[PDB]
Amino acid sequence: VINFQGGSHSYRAKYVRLSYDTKPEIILQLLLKEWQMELPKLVISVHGGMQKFELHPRIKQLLGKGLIKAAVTTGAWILTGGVNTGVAKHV
Amino acid sequence: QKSWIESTLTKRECVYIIPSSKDPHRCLPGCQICQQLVRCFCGRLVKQHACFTASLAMKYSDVKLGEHFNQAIEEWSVEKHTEQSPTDAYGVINFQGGSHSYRAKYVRLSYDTKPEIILQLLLKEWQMELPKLVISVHGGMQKFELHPRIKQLLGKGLIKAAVTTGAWILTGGVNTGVAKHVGDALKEHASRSSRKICTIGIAPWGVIENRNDLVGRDVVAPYQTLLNPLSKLNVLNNLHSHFILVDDGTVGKYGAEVRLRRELEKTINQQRIHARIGQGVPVVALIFEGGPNVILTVLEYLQESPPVPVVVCEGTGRAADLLAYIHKQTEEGGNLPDAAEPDIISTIKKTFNFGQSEAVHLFQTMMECMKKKELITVFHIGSEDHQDIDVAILTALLKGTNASAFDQLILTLAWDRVDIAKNHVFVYGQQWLVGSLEQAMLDALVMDRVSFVKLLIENGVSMHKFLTIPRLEELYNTKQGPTNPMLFHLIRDVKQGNLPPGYKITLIDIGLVIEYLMGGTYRCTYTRKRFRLIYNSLETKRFPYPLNELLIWACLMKRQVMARFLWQHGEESMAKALVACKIYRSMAYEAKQSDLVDDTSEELKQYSNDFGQLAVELLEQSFRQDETMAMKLLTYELKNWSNSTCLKLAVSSRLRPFVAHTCTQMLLSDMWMGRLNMRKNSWYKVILSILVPPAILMLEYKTKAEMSHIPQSQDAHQMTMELPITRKFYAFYHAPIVKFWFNTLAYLGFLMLYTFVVLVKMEQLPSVQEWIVIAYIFTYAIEKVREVFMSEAGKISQKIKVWFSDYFNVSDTIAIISFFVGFGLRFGAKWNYINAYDNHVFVAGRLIYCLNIIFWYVRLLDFLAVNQQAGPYVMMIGKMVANMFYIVVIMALVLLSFGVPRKAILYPHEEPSWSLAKDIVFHPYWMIFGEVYAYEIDVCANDSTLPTICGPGTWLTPFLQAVYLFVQYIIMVNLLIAFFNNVYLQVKAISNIVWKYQRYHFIMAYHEKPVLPPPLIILSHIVSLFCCVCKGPKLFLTEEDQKKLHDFEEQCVEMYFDEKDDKFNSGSEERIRVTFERVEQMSIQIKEVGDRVNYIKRSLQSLDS
Amino acid sequence: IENGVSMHKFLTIPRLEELYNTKQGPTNPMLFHLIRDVKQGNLPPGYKITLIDIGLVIEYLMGGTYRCTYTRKRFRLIYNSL
Amino acid sequence: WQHGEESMAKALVACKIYRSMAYEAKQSDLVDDTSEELKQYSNDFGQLAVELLEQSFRQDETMAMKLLTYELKNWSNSTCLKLAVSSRLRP
Ligand SMILES: CCCCCCCC/C=C/CCCCCCCC(=O)O[C@@H](COC(=O)CCCCCCCCCCCCCCC)COP(=O)([O-])OCC[N+](C)(C)C
Ligand SMILES: CCCCCCCC/C=C/CCCCCCCC(=O)O[C@@H](COC(=O)CCCCCCCCCCCCCCC)COP(=O)([O-])OCC[N+](C)(C)C
Ligand SMILES: CCCCCCCC/C=C/CCCCCCCC(=O)O[C@@H](COC(=O)CCCCCCCCCCCCCCC)COP(=O)([O-])OCC[N+](C)(C)C
Ligand SMILES: CCCCCCCC/C=C/CCCCCCCC(=O)O[C@@H](COC(=O)CCCCCCCCCCCCCCC)COP(=O)([O-])OCC[N+](C)(C)C
Ligand SMILES: CCCCCCCC/C=C\CCCCCCCC(=O)O[C@@H](COC(=O)CCCCCCCCCCCCCCC)COP(=O)([O-])OCC[N+](C)(C)C
Ligand SMILES: CCCCCCCC/C=C\CCCCCCCC(=O)O[C@@H](COC(=O)CCCCCCCCCCCCCCC)COP(=O)([O-])OCC[N+](C)(C)C
Ligand SMILES: CCCCCCCC/C=C\CCCCCCCC(=O)O[C@@H](COC(=O)CCCCCCCCCCCCCCC)COP(=O)([O-])OCC[N+](C)(C)C
Ligand SMILES: CCCCCCCC/C=C\CCCCCCCC(=O)O[C@@H](COC(=O)CCCCCCCCCCCCCCC)COP(=O)([O-])OCC[N+](C)(C)C
Ligand SMILES: CCCCCCCC/C=C\CCCCCCCC(=O)O[C@@H](COC(=O)CCCCCCCCCCCCCCC)COP(=O)([O-])OCC[N+](C)(C)C
Ligand SMILES: CCCCCCCC/C=C\CCCCCCCC(=O)O[C@@H](COC(=O)CCCCCCCCCCCCCCC)COP(=O)([O-])OCC[N+](C)(C)C
Ligand SMILES: C[C@@H]1CC[C@@]2(OC1)O[C@H]1C[C@H]3[C@@H]4CC=C5C[C@@H](OCCC(CO)CO)CC[C@]5(C)[C@H]4CC[C@]3(C)[C@H]1[C@@H]2C
Ligand SMILES: CC(C)CCC[C@@H](C)[C@H]1CC[C@H]2[C@@H]3CC=C4C[C@@H](O)CC[C@]4(C)[C@H]3CC[C@]12C
């Protein structure tokens, strides 16, 4: 479990470090039973470019409210890239 | 001289007199009109001098016989020919305005004054604080009035950047143009920045009206605001708070203070902005609607060590607007497009007719300026261009020095301007050094800058890597912020009293204070062996939980806002809130128990009662989420807080709202049960099973999983691993509910016997009852001794002072001591054998028994106070006896006001006797309870039972008693009814809480007690001494249940802060006020879109062309 | 005042006498019943109120040992001089 | 009253002037009693003094007590407390 140094939030996670050869069954199992996650009603896989400096103020507000609203209401897994640059940075 | 000024500062008097133009104005006789006219090259005429070198010289001619050889006319320089002399004008002017007598501090100095001297006057004499900024405004004079919006913005922004950065707005002083607009700006935003902005106008002693009035050493000198109907002269302006009235010559000559202003624009630059900050005090220049010589002055700034930058205010005027367009239309740092001189010089021409001779000479003063665009700033009014000049001014000193962001940040830190750091210093692309934000954090923590500690964490500063031993030592050893001066009085009281002069505080000395303020068995991380070793030797010097070491720091240094910040950060929130409540509560007690000018205890107890409420509000949050885990949150060992417990910390601070909270009261209810389910059992069956032992094996116990939230003993937890028969008895007899009813039946059986012994004849030797009775009280006393030893804090005196504070435990000692006096006299006494009670040792022994028993009935109220309904009435009785005291003292005085006249009138022939102290108090007291003594009233009546008391004056007594009872019964008894009715609800509310609070000490005392009541307890005592020379409750979690609990703690703190804002934001007071503020902003915009469309409908007939 | 009128230069004796001796605004009709009760009861028809007569009223309404600026010796002299 | 100095002093004088003006209005024959008007006027300045005392006391306690006992020197060498006791201004 990593831990982030931010204002009053020790934000946690669950890193795994697996080989890319892992059977795809094994992955979903880890996600569901070990990490004790509920199967989502939706998966929003975000694909974009990296180091994309900052979006315009309004367009960041809208993609910041809408992705959250369709993920909080449909219990969704937003699959991402992770790197703090571009997509994962804006997510 | 009684003024630092007079010894130091001076004036200038034009000792030497010279001709004017040499033309006597008209009017043929020339010798005397030469006296009438001739303005000295000083500028005042010969007679206006009055100088002593020139006072007894006009008789002959004056100074300088004859023509004086035209060469030597060109020789008056004030230096040789004008004398420095003691000041004559320093004081406090006063302005005549609406309800504001606006004051100032004029000085009147010579322009030769050393620049050191000036800054000294400003700081020590005028008692001004060194500024964090200097906004030197340079503009043109008599600039009529700015447009309404542009005056609003330069009137809010200059005030906002001066009230927030504690700045000195250096000005000109003359009420025309710059100082005129500065002053009006002050008046439009005064009384919020009144005693925060210090505006020093540096004016000459030349162009100055009521000049002769300002003269007067050390005066409250008057001054006007009626602008002299004819004059080109200038009046000082209303709102300038200080004045530097330079003098070289006379009227006119408005160019001798310019150099002195420059000095003060320099001497402030060499001072350090703060004791911790190495940067010098900044200096900025603000140009609005300037002049011809402004652009000259602008040039000087951007060519000095260092370049004082410039913030120009376009859209106001001529020079600004000129300077606006030119540097705007410039190359990135240089020349222009295909020669722009045609428009520029034409543009320069219309403002100021120069005309290619020197309209080019401007282009040079106008080139090096725009070539230094990086140091020049411009506020484009009407284009939201950095959100009034406060951003722009302050920004100007951060962008224009090619400076490190370390220095740019620290300046914001001395300014307390987080927005300018978060929007212009922590902007994308910024690249910081290894530990530069750390040094900013260390400065923010010491300077008590919570809003930067937030920011520096939010960006990237980890308090785990940051916080070390030698650093966290510094943070205690600072004087550069809000300090607790009592932390030295505490560190003194623990280190034997001796504090050497240096005495750099050590963390070990802080650990000793935290042990003393937290009391009991508390052992801090700093006093341990594992820390005293690493410490004296000097990751290991980094603390594992840094935000728990700083929460204590912020509290010991009395920094609540930092404490109420660092508390949200980290884990163990409810624990830290109850520690802090305890630290401030003990800090408060030791403040009241000490001599000091500022009591600082109503401040600390409020600080304590602020964290105490945070703990209760998190308990109510955890309880509303899950009840079983919330009770676990009260009893888990903390392991960073001396193996203590959140409940134990609340009981340590008498934080009754937490112990009286339904969660604790429900855990307390479950520890009372033990392994027994008293939801599917009844008290009949518990009593029955005490008297019928095999009925223990027919009642319902509780599973191990209904006992997980309950703190247990080890042996009790070792019998949750298996229920067998012998286990089922160990579960019954060790329950606190059973130990209670097993003691009540022995105690009720005890009184039944001791009532019997006291009502029945007491023979020579004690009866079997009285032996059973002595045995109880003897062993009952052994138990109380054992309660005191096995209690708490190892200091024998503390255990003593705690146990003697409860009401009934004082009664128990009198009751126990009195009984064995009476037994000693009863049993130790020679029986007479004729008739008992001829031996007075024996009588005295019995009468102590007959009185000692009153202690033992009243002790039943301690057993009856176990009920939820009864117990608050029992505590209530005593709170009312204390509150009715003074009514009853009045009732005792009305009593003696009656009994003494009565006994005196009815018994006149009495010698002194102790019966006179009974008879003045006896009958008048029994009158309060309805005994009127009807046939003793009017002792001369025929129905009288005191017919021999009839005599002179006895007819007075029935009148006296009529008044007496009216006062006692009709006024005083009913006043006491009225007392009780109107105090009932609030004593009943207190007594319910004190009842719920003392239910901890009671229930937790019945975990430690032996199993056998005080007759048979001696077995349990002996067995506990055998296993003492031959061999409390804790909450056991497995490591996964500790995980699930720390999650539950975190999750409930989040819901607390989330739901607190969701309620604040969703309130009508908050929805009216943000609606209020939006309708303002809209209305502004609607009368601007309404303006633009008015600039569109004009563009229907123009496009029509 | 906000513009420039200084009440120090404005307010003088013969002027501040006028301000008591006006009927061109809201008046206290009892100020004559008070100035009567201190000046023995006799008010001639004109009777232009004097500040010394006002000082006597302020002493009577404030009670005790109160001595106003108008009843002092230093004012009864400058006053009757002007 | 807002103009000038010695505010709390002048508020307690005025309370005393109106209170005595009110008593001499009730102790006299007249069509308009003009005493409920004057006593209200008195009790209006009396409240100004209390509200300035509460303002001085919340700022500094030691100097606020000094504000009760300094000789006034424009008010017959009197004292702001003595003027309040003179008007039975109990608050
Ligand atoms: C929280 C817990 C707190 C605990 C608090 C406990 C505090 C306990 C406090 C105790 C105080 C005790 C005071 C007793 C007073 C005795 C005086 C007396 O009776 O004198 C008489 C008997 O004189 C004798 O010598 C009698 C000897 C035989 C009887 C034994 C006495 C037992 C004492 C009990 C031991 C108690 C055991 C205590 C166990 C705890 C003298 O009178 P006389 O004989 O008629 O005349 C003699 C005159 N002549 C000589 C001229 C003939
Ligand atoms: C266990 C025995 C219980 C028996 C009752 C014994 C009394 C129980 C009393 C409880 C609380 C009240 C205060 C304690 C009393 C002690 C003296 C005292 O305080 O004097 C006070 C002055 O009082 C005087 O100067 C007058 C005393 C005259 C005595 C007359 C006695 C006869 C009548 C009456 C006798 C009949 C009994 C009346 C019962 C209703 C000073 O008090 P204070 O400084 O203003 O402090 C008040 C509280 N405070 C600290 C929060 C501010
Ligand atoms: C917090 C509570 C604490 C208490 C506070 C109040 C203090 C209370 C203090 C009261 C003073 C009493 C002093 C007694 C005087 C000496 C008595 C004596 O010598 O013998 C008498 C004692 O025997 C008795 O029977 C009388 C005992 C007094 C009973 C008191 C009841 C009234 C309570 C009053 C309450 C209101 C108090 C009002 C305020 C002052 C017997 O009779 P005698 O004739 O006197 O002497 C023998 C002669 N003979 C055999 C011929 C008969
Ligand atoms: C509502 C009903 C009332 C009607 C209204 C009219 C009033 C009627 C009254 C009238 C007064 C006149 C009566 C005196 C009779 C003759 C003398 C005589 O016998 O004296 C007797 C007593 O009495 C006295 O010694 C004097 C009593 C005076 C007080 C009476 C009350 C005053 C009014 C109200 C005061 C309230 C407060 C005032 C403020 C409001 C003597 O007799 P003895 O006492 O039995 O003793 C004799 C034996 N020995 C010789 C051994 C001692
Ligand atoms: C330390 C903890 C103690 C706990 C209790 C354990 C110990 C208790 C056990 C035993 C102790 C008793 C020993 C008795 C010895 C004989 C006495 C004797 O000679 O005669 C007496 C008999 O006895 C009684 O009448 C009882 C006396 C005590 C009163 C009530 C006890 C109830 C409490 C305890 C038990 C219930 C508990 C209730 C709980 C809710 C009286 O005889 P009589 O017939 O009246 O005399 C005729 C009168 N005549 C001469 C005028 C004609
Ligand atoms: C200054 C005096 C000494 C100090 C006392 C200080 C108090 C110390 C405390 C306690 C005293 C110890 C217990 C009682 C002692 C009895 C003694 C006695 O004479 O008994 C007599 C009867 O009476 C009994 O036998 C009573 C037995 C019941 C006692 C109650 C406890 C039992 C519970 C168990 C649990 C633990 C119980 C114990 C917990 C402590 C028998 O004696 P005797 O000689 O045959 O006859 C009497 C005399 N005669 C010959 C003249 C007729
Ligand atoms: C640590 C706590 C304090 C303890 C204090 C100390 C306690 C112990 C105190 C005193 C010790 C006992 C003294 C012995 C008696 C001497 C006289 C004598 O022998 O007999 C005489 C007794 O004459 C009397 O007057 C007896 C009165 C005794 C009661 C007084 C004590 C009250 C204690 C207060 C309560 C405290 C309760 C506790 C409060 C917390 C007469 O009897 P005789 O001789 O057999 O025959 C007749 C002869 N003659 C007629 C010629 C005279
Ligand atoms: C051999 C012997 C055979 C058996 C003997 C039998 C002996 C019988 C013994 C006792 C009688 C009482 C029985 C009722 C109990 C009810 C249940 C209970 O616990 O209630 C409460 C009583 O809690 C106490 O602690 C009560 C103590 C009683 C002693 C005081 C006597 C008063 C004497 C003065 C009067 C003078 C007259 C006295 C007579 C002259 C506590 O409950 P609670 O805290 O509310 O918890 C429940 C909360 N809930 C409802 C939310 C779930
Ligand atoms: C013989 C048999 C008689 C009947 C038996 C009766 C047995 C008794 C029955 C019931 C007792 C009630 C239980 C008390 C509960 C605890 C209260 C406590 O701790 O203290 C309370 C006070 O102190 C008291 O209240 C003292 C005890 C009061 C007893 C009343 C005696 C009055 C008689 C005397 C007059 C007699 C006149 C005649 C004189 C001769 C708590 O007070 P507080 O407010 O929390 O804090 C105090 C501080 N403060 C002052 C700042 C507020
Ligand atoms: C309430 C307003 C005022 C109204 C009051 C009305 C005034 C009342 C009217 C009249 C005055 C009182 C006397 C009248 C009765 C005389 C008859 C007489 O002889 O009586 C007795 C004596 O009594 C005296 O000698 C008493 C003398 C004056 C007492 C003091 C004034 C009482 C008034 C207090 C006012 C309190 C005011 C409180 C103020 C709030 C009986 O004497 P004797 O036994 O017959 O003589 C023989 C004796 N020998 C045998 C031993 C020799
Ligand atoms: C403020 C309150 C005013 C009222 C009051 O409290 C204080 O003032 C107290 C003074 C007390 C008297 C002092 C002196 C004695 C002498 C004594 O003489 C022994 C006689 C003999 C035996 O026969 C020796 O052998 C008898 C008692 C007596 C008269 C006192 C009585 C009570 C009095 C009046 C008290 C009363 C309650
Ligand atoms: C003047 C002396 C010598 C005579 C006796 C005084 C009376 C008033 C004494 C004798 C014994 C006393 C009682 C003894 C025990 C208790 C229990 C305690 O928790 C409250 C007070 C109380 C209830 C006492 C009240 C006063 C009392 C009744």
Short mmCIF file of C-alpha atoms in Angstrom, two decimals, chain C residues 1 28-30 33-34 37 58 60-63 65-69 72, chain D residues 3 12-13 16-17 20-22 24-25 30 32 38 74-76 83 86:
data_model
loop_
_atom_site.label_atom_id
_atom_site.label_comp_id
_atom_site.label_asym_id
_atom_site.label_seq_id
_atom_site.Cartn_x
_atom_site.Cartn_y
_atom_site.Cartn_z
CA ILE C 1 -17.65 69.77 8.25
CA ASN C 28 -37.27 72.63 24.08
CA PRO C 29 -39.97 74.94 25.54
CA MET C 30 -38.82 73.80 29.00
CA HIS C 33 -39.02 77.04 32.46
CA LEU C 34 -35.57 75.94 33.67
CA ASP C 37 -36.38 78.36 37.97
CA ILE C 58 -26.28 72.71 33.74
CA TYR C 60 -28.84 72.37 38.47
CA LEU C 61 -29.51 69.46 36.10
CA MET C 62 -26.18 67.77 36.89
CA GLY C 63 -26.53 68.28 40.64
CA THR C 65 -20.75 69.86 43.22
CA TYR C 66 -20.88 70.35 39.45
CA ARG C 67 -19.32 73.61 38.24
CA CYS C 68 -19.73 74.38 34.54
CA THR C 69 -17.29 76.29 32.36
CA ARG C 72 -16.57 80.10 36.59
CA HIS D 3 -17.41 64.17 16.75
CA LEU D 12 -23.13 59.83 30.64
CA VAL D 13 -23.50 63.60 30.99
CA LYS D 16 -27.81 62.92 33.30
CA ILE D 17 -29.03 66.10 31.56
CA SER D 20 -32.96 65.72 35.14
CA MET D 21 -34.76 67.47 32.30
CA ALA D 22 -37.25 64.59 32.47
CA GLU D 24 -38.43 68.55 36.04
CA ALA D 25 -40.88 67.93 33.19
CA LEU D 30 -47.81 71.22 30.76
CA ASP D 32 -47.16 67.64 26.47
CA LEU D 38 -36.56 62.72 27.50
CA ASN D 74 -13.90 69.57 31.01
CA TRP D 75 -16.71 68.11 33.15
CA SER D 76 -16.04 69.67 36.56
CA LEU D 83 -21.62 60.50 36.32
CA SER D 86 -25.40 60.24 39.45
#
